[PDB]
Amino acid sequence: ATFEIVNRCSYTVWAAASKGDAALDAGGRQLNSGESWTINVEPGTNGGKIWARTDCYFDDSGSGICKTGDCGGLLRCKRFGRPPTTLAEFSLNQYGKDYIDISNIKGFNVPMNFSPTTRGCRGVRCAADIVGQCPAKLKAPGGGCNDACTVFQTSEYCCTTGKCGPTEYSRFFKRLCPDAFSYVLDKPTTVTCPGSSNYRVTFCPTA
């Protein structure tokens, strides 16, 4: 499958792509404002994610650090990144269909559109100014807007079974981005696409 990753933001981002135990394609790359990076994601990739990282620096070998979304200090990510990270999540060729979503469950850093470039399904977007509106307690010192479970580490915010529901801090994200997950038990906002679709992830998509 082809994934085009396009940075429309005014700032540089360091894109990342991983399935948790390995890189997808090169795993990560600097994207200047306006730059695009096209990757190949193997058919049958389950549990893949793409995200942006902000305020990074790397040496010539690809070792360094990012303020949001750092993946073990690497440019070429092999594992998932440190919150807060807006997440494009996908599982491909799963019993004939692909499944895509955007999630704020691990916070928000950069606005994103995640859309098919082939026929037969909708895209999703979370492009509100979540960082500017971030509630004071959720502001991340290094930039971005943390999810409540990361900040508070209580069952109310982190529960995955219960006795578990939305809160004002999960609703903060859901109100601004209805089409992205805000907590683990949200009514799903996953899109089912034809198997073997192609996609574009756009950072700071055009309104």
Curated annotation (Swiss-Prot):
Belongs to the thaumatin family. Disulfide bonds join C9-C204, C56-C66, C71-C77, C121-C193, C126-C177, C134-C145, C149-C158, C159-C164. It comes from the Eukaryota. Its main location: cytoplasm. It is found in: Cytoplasmic vesicle. This is Thaumatin I. Taste-modifying protein; intensely sweet-tasting. It is 100000 times sweeter than sucrose on a molar basis. Pfam families: Thaumatin. It comes from Thaumatococcus daniellii.
